[PDB]
Amino acid sequence: GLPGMQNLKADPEELFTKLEKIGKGSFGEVFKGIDNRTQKVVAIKIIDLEEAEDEIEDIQQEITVLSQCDSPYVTKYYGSYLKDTKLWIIMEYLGGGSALDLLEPGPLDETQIATILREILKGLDYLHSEKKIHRDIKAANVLLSEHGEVKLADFGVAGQLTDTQIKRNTFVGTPFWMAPEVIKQSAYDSKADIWSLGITAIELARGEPPHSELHPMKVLFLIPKNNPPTLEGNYSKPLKEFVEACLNKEPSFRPTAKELLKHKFILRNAKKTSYLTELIDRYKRWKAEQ
Ligand SMILES: COCCOc1ccc2c(c1)ncn2-c1ccc2cccc(N3CCC(N)CC3)c2n1
């Protein structure tokens, strides 16, 4: 049973105006769309079920995880529709762009970095409290509203802890951002997300994660074997220490999301999310390029 499945008489090509492609996630392409009843903009993931071979269960799991989340920091799921062989999956649209998009005009300042990290941490705190693990935290999966609100996206590989399975062992994620214990397929939990957050912090500061120049298969040994990455360059000591705190090889040595919300880098530098509109405006004016 697929949570939020609508009446199969409903025609999504009638109910929604499909616009441009805006992304490609772990499973399926995502489009901008208009809800023709409300005129609100939505994000629509479209899946050809006739093609999908092993990914239908994955697609279903993603929708299930989203449907179980109710947070200002997690993309909303509205429902799903069928048009012949294609599944239209209707979700929240955030018009500011991903944090990675917003990096294209130039570097972030540490106030922007701290603000974005703080909001990511609020989302992680929510998820981890629900015993969920995102497992694909990276700047491309951090979306901003046109007002500067920051939300987590793409739950395509998200994990669920239960009283039966206290830990996971699945090899999932995006290689450069994956925790060493995930790569080794040791037993892991929400601390894996804290490692990915540290990598994302480096990404927000420098524009790319560590090892970005290498073939992803090399991280299969590099991340488990090497000392953890550090933030190199002219950045504040609290930011460098924030990164170090996240990027410890031992998961029990990483702070919780809740704890990092009080980290000196966050408290000293983060400001109102509304200020992030400057970053969104910067990107709009920048992509006014021929
Ligand atoms: C240039 O920026 C234009 C806005 O770009 C986007 C891109 C994706 C968006 C979005 C806005 N508003 C909501 N989403 C969603 C909504 C539901 C999603 C489900 C699975 C995967 C997604 N994305 C996340 C961003 C990533 N970069 C690619 C895959 C999803 N993205």
Curated annotation (Swiss-Prot):
Source organism superkingdom: Eukaryota
Name of the protein in its database record: Serine/threonine-protein kinase 24 36 kDa subunit
Native species: Homo sapiens (Human)
Binding site for ATP: 22-30, 45, 92-94
Chain positions found as Phosphothreonine: 170
Residue span(s) of domain Protein kinase: 16-266
Residues the record marks as active site: 136
Residues where Mg(2+) binds: 141, 154
Result, substituting residue 45 to A: Loss of activity and autophosphorylation
Residues of the full protein shown: 20 to 310 of 443
Motif stretch (Bipartite nuclear localization signal): 258-272
Positions in coiled-coil regions: none
